[model samples]
Target: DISAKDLRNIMYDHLPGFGTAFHQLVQVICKLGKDSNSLDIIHAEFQASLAEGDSPQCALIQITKRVPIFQDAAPPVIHIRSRGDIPRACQKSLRPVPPSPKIDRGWVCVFQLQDGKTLGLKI
Candidate 1:
């Protein structure tokens, strides 16, 4: 048998939205003690995100709308090109392409990092 305090901590530490979900679950459970309907509602809500293609960003949006740590994380825009000429033009516009072993046939993604810096990744 797990103590309620330990169960609560473990849930909060590992589950991103557990604080809110657990609070709601506990309240419902208290109101409907040992009721199967209350337990089902809690379980369904908790699992809904998993089925919705939830990402870390989506989780952050769900939990708090904005996480302070990632306030500076601008969504990166990916630019893809299929021809060699575009890359050559990029090399001229940006700078000499840095040595990368990943470059192969016909596709590359240019990542524009913060501070006006750019890096290329072969996708």
Candidate 2:
């Protein structure tokens, strides 16, 4: 229930461009309706994408392409909080800058607050 919503919030809402593999994972979770062990499965699958070093797919590279203003206020950490019971978690594993220097701008790694209900700022 909430898990799928939050996952989608972070996946499609905050980050983007995870390629078809990520899309497939999301679809699978949606199909399963976030039932038993869904988080476990999704977390493991997420780690698999990271572990395999597919930067283009799993690393949330698109976030770095945000407007330049974000760089100035880009904190090293960000907290996404949910209801009273759900844990507040912050994943700062995304790269701040792109490897290719073709884009001459100070990229910032952050989740947008425009309708970002779960995206809360934290130290």
Candidate 3:
């Protein structure tokens, strides 16, 4: 019953039960893959967490290389265009960790379900 916008907010600091929601979101997106700069955020944060000498989930998130199978029960693939498409709470956290090279195109946001089907949004 969650939308991508809600999921983004959950990824930040929304509700207490976000831990489970965030975990699932990351799993889908990791398989769906990040935007070019999006991956950098993970890289940076993973290192940051490591800097604190804590075992981080980022490293483990990368271990998933195969697509999961769920032809009929896959979650909806939500598509987003810009930061505004997400809730205000998540805008800040979703940015790239470090300023990277800017690509010449406007990147789009989309989601891939467990069935390996991608859905794009026009916003």
Q: Per-candidate TM vs. native?
A: 0.22, 0.30, 0.24
lDDT of 1 by residue, 13-103 (tens): 5344432423332332222322322333333333455467774323323322222222222222343333242334244333323544221
Minimal lDDT window, size 10, model 3: 99-108
Question: If both were scored by TM-score, which would come out higher, candidate 1 or candidate 2?
Answer: 2
lDDT of 2 by residue, 2-120 (tens): 46766655555424554333343343333343544345445445455566675523433322233232223333222334323222232332233334322113222233323443322
Model 2 poorest ten-residue lDDT run: 101-110
Which ranges in model 2 have alpha carbons more than 4 Å from their true place? Answer: 13-25, 55-123
Q: Between the candidate structures 1 and 2, which one is better when assessed by lDDT?
A: 2
Model 2 — TM-score against the truth? 0.30
Q: What value of lDDT does candidate 1 attain over all alpha carbons?
A: 0.34
Candidate 1's displacement at residue 10, Å, is: 8.1
